[PDB]
Ligand binder design. Structure first.
Ligand SMILES: CCCCCCCCCCCCCCCCCC(=O)OC[C@H](COP(=O)([O-])OCC(O)COP(=O)([O-])OC[C@@H](COC(=O)CCCCCCCCCCCCCCCCC)OC(=O)CCCCCCCCCCCCCCCCC)OC(=O)CCCCCCCCCCCCCCCCC
Ligand SMILES: CCCCCCCCCCCC(=O)SCCNC(=O)CCNC(=O)[C@H](O)C(C)(C)COP(=O)(O)O
Lengths: 308, 250, 50, 82, 84, 161, 59
C-alpha cells in the first residue's frame, strides 16, 4: 500500500496493541475496573431475573459432530476417531464416529451433520439441514444439494434385511423442507420442496418428485417420470429440456455453495476488518472530501493506493 | 475457493468447519455484492438466517429457524409481514413464466411454519398455511389464503378473496368480509406483538462473547496471539493474483 | 445491492510528425493520451523503406 | 365496479389539450433578472410616491390581481405568430 | 401498428427501389422479391436498405436484414417501428 | 342460484408480450400481465432509473411514470382525465417540465395505459425526456449511462432529500 | 423453475459491405469530403470495388 503511517487502532480494530503511553495504560486499568464492576452488576441483575438469569454461552459446532461408536456395527460411511484422554476418564467412550467430507464440500454452521455421513466433493449441506447417521450410514454423492431445513433419516436394517441406509446419488437436488428417510436416490434427480420420501423408495435417474408430494413406502419411481400428489402419482414424463434444467440446478447450487462457504469461513478479525472496510467505503462516497484530493483509495480495501 | 474480486476483498484466513469449536452462524450476513437491508423494528431470531439481497421493511418479523436466502435474486418482505418458524423464503434466478423472479411479499402477510416460498408474488393481507409450497411464478392476489398442506404449481394464480386448498390447490370458498378485513391483518399484528416482546428482552451484545474472549486472552497471555493487518494482506494477495494472471500462458 | 463504480475515457489521438530533436530520420508517431499522459503509442514506419 | 365521476370531454381531445403544455421552456433567470432590477429601482421610486387613500390602494391591488396572468397561461397559449 | 400511413411509406420505398438500375420496367410494386423478382444483388439490397436508412431516419438490424425478403417486408418493417 | 365457478387462468395464458424500444435503440420483449399498468410492467422488467420520472402531482409522486410512444390503434385504451381536476395538473406539469419539445402526437404517460389482451405484441418506444429536477436525489442530469434498475429503488418517492 | 408451459457465413462479403456503408459518414466527416461527394455516390463505388473479386469461390 501507499502509506505505512496508519494508526495502530486503524490497522488492528479487533484488538488494539498493548498500551505504551502513560495515558493509554491508565485507560487500560480504568477499563479493567469498569469490566469487573459491570460483571458484578450483571450478576446482581441476574439474581432478580430468576431461574436461568438470561445467561448466554457459546454453542457447540454440530456441523461436524460425532456419534457413539458401536463395536458391533462398524462405521460404514464416516470415519472413527479417538477422543481426548481426560474425556476418556470422564465419559468412558473409547472411540467416536465422525462425519467424512471432502474439502470442496460446504456445510453451513447452522446445519447438524451427525456421525455416519459421507458427503462428496462440491456437495452442499445448507442451513438447518439435519443429517443423522446415528444408527445407520448416510451417503451423499458429488454435486448434491441438501437444501434448507431438510431432514435426512435412517433406521436399522432389522430381521428382514431390508436396507435402511440412505444413498443419494450425484447431481441430486433435494428441495427445501423435504424429509428423506431411509431411501435410495439415483443420479440427476430433483426432489421437490416439501416432498416426503419414505422407507424403501427407489427414485430412478432423470425423474422429478414434485413439491409437497409424499411418495408411499416401497415405491419405485421409474426413470424420466414426474410424480406428484399426497399419494404421489405419475402425471407426465420429463421433457428433454427439463433434464438440462436438472443439471443446471445442480451446477448453480454448486456455485452458490462455493460463495456461501467463502463468506462463512472468514475468521472474526477478518470479518470485523471487512465491516470497517464497508463503513469507510460509505464515508468515502463523498468525493469532495479533503482526503480524496490527497489520495486515490483502493476499491476492495479502502487504503491509499496512489496520490491524486 | 477465494473470490479475488469480492467487494471487501479476498479472504486472508479461511477456517475449516472441523476446526470450529463453537457455532459462529450470523443471523444477517453479506453474500459477495448483495447486502440485506433491515429497518429498526425488524426482529430476526437468533436461529434465523437472512443472507443476500433481502429487504426487510418496518415491523417485519423473522422467527426461529426461518431461512430467507436472497442469493439468486431479490427478496422483499412488506410491512408487518411475519415469517414464522422453519419457513424458507428463496428466490430463483429466472422464472418459468418469464416475469421477474424476485420473491416479493406484501404487507400483513403471514407465512406459517415450514412453508416454502420461491420466486412468488404474495399480495397484501395473505396467509400461507403450514407446509404450503408456492412454486416459481405463482402469484397470490391480495386477501387470499392458502390452506395448510397445499401446493401452488409454477405459473398458477389464486384470485383475491378466495380460500384455496389441496395439493393441486383448488377453490374451496370465498373468504368473508370480516375475515379479509380483520383476521388476516390481526394475525400479523399478533405476531408483531410476540416479536416485539422477544426484542424487548434482547441485549445489544449478549454475554456469549465472553467465552471466546477467554480463549483469545489465554492466547494473548501465552504469546501465541498474532496481530494481522488483514487490509494490507488483502491488497498484496490481489496484487499477486493480477501479476500471476498476466504471467499465465493458458 | 452494492453500487458500481464508473471510469474515465481517453481521447487526444495526437500525431507526432517528423521532428528534428529526435533520433535522426523521419518518425510518424500516433499517440493516444489521457490528458497529458500517454496511454498508447503506435509508431508508423515505412517512410524509409527502400 | 364502483360509481365514479363522469369526466367531461373525450380522452384524446383532453390529452391533446394537455399536450399543448409541452413547449420549449425558457429558464426562469431571464424573468428573475428583470424583476430584480426593476424591483430594486421600483422600491427606490416608491419612497417618493404620493400617499394614497387606503380605498384606492385596495382597488389597485384588486385590479392588479385580476390583471395578473399566470406564467403557465402564457405558456400554453403562446404562438410565435403576428 | 402502422405508425404512419401505409400508402406514404410504400410510395417512398418504391421510389427508392426505382433508383436502383433494375427493379423496374414492367413490375415495380409489392410482392416482389428483391433477388428473385427484381434482379437485385445482395450488396445492392444492403445499399437499398441504407438508402431507406437515409429516407426514414431509423436503423435496420443486420439479423433483420437476414429476415427481410420483399418490398412488402421492408415497408412492414418501417411501419412497425415507432421511430419511423 | 349457484352458477358455474370459473377457474382462473394460469400466468402463461394471461401474459402478453410488448416490444419496447429503449433509448439506445434496442428492442426489448417485456412480458407483462393483463390488468397491470404499463409503468409497473416497464419497471419490473429491469429498465434503468433514468428511464422513469415520478408522477408530478400533489399526491402522486410515489408513482413512477415514463414518456412513451403509443401507436394510433391503441389510443383508445388511454385513460380520460378531467381538466378541472388536479390529475390534469400532474399531466400538464409532466409535459411542461419533462417532455417539452420532444412531444409528439403519440406521446403519453405509462400510468394512464393499462395492459390487456388486445395489446399483445404492441410496439411502444420510450420517448426522449429533458433534464428534470425535483430533489437532488430525484433528478435527471441528461445522461442515460447508469446501469441500475428502477426496481432496485426502495425509496417510494420525492420528499426533502 | 420448470413447467411444461415454460419451454414451448456464405455472406461474409455482405457483412463487410455493410460495415463499409455504415462507416461511410464517419470517413466523410474525418476526410472533409462532404462538399465534394455524397454518401450515396461513394456507396456506389464500393460495390464496384467488391464486384472485381466475384470469380473466386474458395473459402
Ligand atoms: C419586464 C419584467 C416583467 C415583470 C414586470 C414587473 C417587474 C417588477 C417591477 C416591480 C416589482 C415589485 C411589485 C410587483 C408585485 C410584487 C410581486 C413580486 O415581485 O414577486 C415576484 C414575482 C415572481 O415571483 P415568483 O416566486 O417566481 O412567483 C410566485 C407565483 O407562484 C408565480 O407563479 P404563477 O404566476 O403561476 O401563480 C400566480 C399566483 C401567485 O399568487 C399571487 O400572485 C399572490 C398575489 C396576492 C396579492 C399580493 C399582495 C397584495 C398586496 C399589495 C400591497 C399594495 C396595496 C396595499 C393594500 C392592499 C391590501 C390587500 O396567483 C394566481 O394564481 C393568479 C391570481 C393572482 C392574484 C391572486 C389573488 C386573487 C384575488 C382576487 C379575487 C377576485 C376573485 C373573485 C372571484 C373568484 C371566483 C371563485 O414577480 C412578479 O410576479 C412581478 C410581476 C408584476 C405584475 C404585478 C401586477 C400588479 C402588481 C401590483 C398589484 C399587487 C397585487 C399582486 C398581483 C400578483 C403579483 C404577483
Ligand atoms: C472509402 C473506403 C472504401 C473501402 C473500399 C473497400 C473495398 C473492399 C473490396 C473487397 C472485395 C471483397 O471483399 S470480395 C469477397 C470475396 N469474393 C467472393 O466472391 C466470395 C463470394 N462472392 C460472392 O458471393 C459474390 O461474388 C458477391 C458479389 C460478393 C456477392 O456477395 P455475397 O457473399 O454477400 O453474396
Amino acid at each position: 500500500s501507499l502509506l505505512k503511517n496508519y494508526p495502530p487502532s486503524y490497522l488492528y480494530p479487533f484488538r488494539h496493541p498493548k498500551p505504551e503511553g502513560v495515558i493509554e495504560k491508565v485507560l487500560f486499568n480504568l477499563g479493567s475496573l469498569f469490566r469487573s464492576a459491570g460483571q458484578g452488576m450483571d450478576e446482581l441483575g441476574s439474581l432478580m431475573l430468576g431461574n436461568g438469569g438470561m445467561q448466554e454461552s457459546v454453542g457447540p459446532n454440530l456441523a461436524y459432530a460425532p456419534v457413539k461408536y458401536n463395536p458391533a456395527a462398524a462405521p460404514k460411511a464416516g470415519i472413527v476417531a479417538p477422543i481426548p484422554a481426560s474425556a476418556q476418564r470422564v465419559l468412558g467412550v473409547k472411540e467416536i464416529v465422525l462425519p467424512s467430507k471432502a474439502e470442496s464440500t460446504f456445510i453451513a454452521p447452522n446445519a447438524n451433520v451427525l456421525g455416519d455421513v459421507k458427503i462428496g466433493a462440491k456437495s452442499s449441506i445448507w442451513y438447518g439441514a439435519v443429517l443423522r447417521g446415528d444408527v445407520n450410514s448416510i451417503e451423499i454423492g458429488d454435486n448434491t444439494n441438501v437444501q434448507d431445513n431438510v431432514t435426512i433419516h435412517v433406521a436399522k436394517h432389522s430381521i428382514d434385511g431390508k436396507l435402511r441406509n440412505t444413498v443419494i446419488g450425484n447431481n441430486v437436488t433435494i428441495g427445501h423442507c423435504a424429509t428423506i428417510h431411509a431411501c435410495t436416490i439415483a443420479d440427476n434427480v430433483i426432489i421437490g420442496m416439501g416432498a416426503t420420501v419414505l422407507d424403501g423408495v427407489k427414485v430412478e435417474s432423470g425423474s422429478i418428485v414434485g413439491a409437497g408430494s409424499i411418495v408411499p413406502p416401497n415405491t419405485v419411481i421409474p426413470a424420466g417420470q414426474v410424480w406428484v400428489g399426497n399419494p404421489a402419482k405419475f402425471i407426465r414424463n420429463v421433457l428433454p429440456e427439463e433434464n438440462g434444467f436438472i443439471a443446471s440446478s445442480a451446477n448453480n447450487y454448486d456455485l452458490l455453495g462455493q460463495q456461501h462457504k467463502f463468506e462463512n469461513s472468514k475468521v472474526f478479525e477478518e470479518m470485523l476488518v471487512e465491516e470497517e472496510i464497508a463503513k469507510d467505503r460509505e464515508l468515502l462516497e463523498d468525493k469532495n472530501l479533503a482526503v480524496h484530493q490527497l489520495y486515490i483509495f483502493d476499491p476492495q480495501t479502502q487504503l491509499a493506493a496512489r496520490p491524486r | 475457493v477465494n473470490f479475488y474480486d469480492a467487494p471487501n476483498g479476498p479472504a486472508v484466513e479461511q477456517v475449516k468447519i472441523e476446526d470450529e469449536w463453537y457455532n459462529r452462524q450470523r443471523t444477517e450476513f453479506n453474500i459477495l455484492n448483495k447486502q440485506p437491508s433491515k429497518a429498526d423494528d425488524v426482529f430476526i431470531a437468533p436461529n434465523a438466517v437472512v443472507c443476500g439481497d433481502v429487504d426487510l421493511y418496518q415491523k417485519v418479523s423473522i422467527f426461529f429457524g426461518a431461512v430467507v436466502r436472497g442469493d439468486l435474486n431479490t427478496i422483499r418482505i412488506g410491512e408487518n409481514s411475519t415469517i414464522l418458524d422453519k419457513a424458507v423464503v428463496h428466490a430463483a434466478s429466472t422464472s418459468p413464466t418469464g416475469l421477474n423472479a424476485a420473491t416479493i411479499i406484501g404487507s400483513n402477510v403471514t407465512v406459517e411454519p415450514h412453508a416454502v416460498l420461491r420466486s412468488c408474488r404474495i399480495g397484501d393481507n395473505c396467509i400461507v398455511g403450514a407446509r404450503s409450497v408456492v412454486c416459481e411464478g405463482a402469484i397470490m392476489h391480495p386477501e387470499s389464503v392458502l390452506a395448510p398442506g397445499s401446493v401452488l404449481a409454477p405459473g398458477r394464480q389464486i384470485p383475491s378473496g378466495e380460500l384455496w386448498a389441496g395439493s393441486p390447490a383448488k377453490f374451496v370458498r370465498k373468504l368473508t368480509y370480516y375475515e379479509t378485513s380483520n383476521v388476516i391483518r390481526e394475525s400479523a399484528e399478533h405476531y408483531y406483538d410476540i416479536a416485539t416482546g422477544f426484542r424487548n428482552e434482547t441485549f445489544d451484545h449478549g454475554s456469549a462473547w465472553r467465552d471466546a474472549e477467554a480463549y483469545r486472552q489465554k492466547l494473548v497471555d501465552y504469546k501465541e496471539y498474532n496481530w494481522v493487518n488483514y487490509r494490507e494482506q488483502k491488497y498484496v494477495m490481489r496484487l499477486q493474483r493480477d501479476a500471476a494472471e498476466l504471467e499465465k500462458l493458458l | 445491492m452494492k453500487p458500481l463504480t464508473p471510469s474515465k475515457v481517453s481521447n487526444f489521438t495526437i500525431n507526432f510528425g517528423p521532428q528534428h530533436p529526435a533520433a535522426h530520420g523521419v518518425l510518424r508517431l500516433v499517440l493516444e493520451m489521457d490528458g497529458e499522459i500517454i496511454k498508447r503509442a503506435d509508431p508508423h514506419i515505412g517512410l524509409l523503406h527502400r | 365496479d364502483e360509481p365514479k365521476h363522469q369526466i367531461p370531454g373525450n380522452a384524446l381531445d383532453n390529452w391533446a389539450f394537455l399536450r399543448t403544455y409541452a413547449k420549449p421552456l425558457p429558464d426562469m433567470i431571464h424573468y428573475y433578472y428583470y424583476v430584480y432590477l426593476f424591483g430594486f429601482f421600483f422600491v427606490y421610486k416608491v419612497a417618493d410616491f404620493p400617499e394614497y387613500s387606503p380605498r384606492v390602494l385596495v382597488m389597485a391591488a384588486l385590479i392588479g390581481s385580476l390583471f395578473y396572468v399566470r406564467r403557465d397561461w402564457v405558456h400554453r397559449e403562446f404562438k410565435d405568430s403576428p | 401498428s402502422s405508425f404512419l400511413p401505409k400508402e406514404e411509406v410504400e410510395s417512398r420505398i418504391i421510389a427508392q427501389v426505382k433508383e436502383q438500375n433494375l427493379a423496374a420496367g414492367i413490375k415495380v410494386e409489392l410482392s416482389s422479391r428483391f433477388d428473385k423478382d427484381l434482379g437485385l444483388d445482395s450488396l445492392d439490397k444492403v445499399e437499398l436498405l441504407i438508402s431507406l436508412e437515409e429516407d426514414f431516419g431509423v436503423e435496420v438490424p443486420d439479423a433483420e436484414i437476414d429476415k427481410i425478403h420483399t418490398v412488402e417486408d421492408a415497408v412492414n418493417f418501417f411501419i412497425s417501428n415507432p421511430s419511423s | 342460484d349457484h352458477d358455474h365457478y370459473t377457474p382462473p387462468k394460469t400466468v402463461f395464458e394471461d401474459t402478453i408480450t410488448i416490444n419496447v424500444l429503449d433509448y439506445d435503440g434496442k428492442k426489448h420483449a417485456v412480458k407483462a400481465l393483463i390488468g397491470t399498468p404499463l409503468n409497473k410492467a416497464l419497471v419490473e422488467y429491469g429498465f434503468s432509473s433514468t428511464y422513469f420520472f415520478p408522477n408530478m402531482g400533489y399526491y402522486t409522486q410515489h408513482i413512477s411514470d415514463a414518456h412513451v410512444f403509443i401507436p394510433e390503434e391503441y389510443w383508445k385504451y388511454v385513460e380520460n382525465v378531467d381538466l378541472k381536476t388536479d390529475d390534469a395538473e400532474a399531466i400538464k406539469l409532466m409535459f411542461k417540465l419533462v417532455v417539452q419539445d420532444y412531444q409528439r402526437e403519440t406521446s403519453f404517460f405509462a400510468s394512464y395505459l393499462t395492459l390487456n389482451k388486445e395489446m399483445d405484441n404492441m410496439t411502444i418506444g420510450f420517448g426522449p425526456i429533458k433534464p428534470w429536477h425535483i430533489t437532488p436525489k430525484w433528478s435527471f442530469n441528461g445522461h442515460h449511462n447508469v446501469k441500475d434498475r428502477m426496481f432496485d429503488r426502495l425509496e417510494t418517492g420525492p420528499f426533502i432529500e | 423453475m420448470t413447467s411444461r408451459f415454460a419451454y414451448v457465413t456464405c455472406q461474409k462479403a455482405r457483412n463487410l459491405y455493410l460495415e463499409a456503408c455504415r462507416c461511410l459518414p464517419f470517413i466523410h466527416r474525418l476526410h472533409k469530403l462532404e462538399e465534394i461527394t455524397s454518401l450515396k455516390e461513394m456507396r456506389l463505388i464500393i460495390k464496384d470495388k467488391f464486384r472485381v473479386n466475384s470469380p473466386v469461390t474458395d473459402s
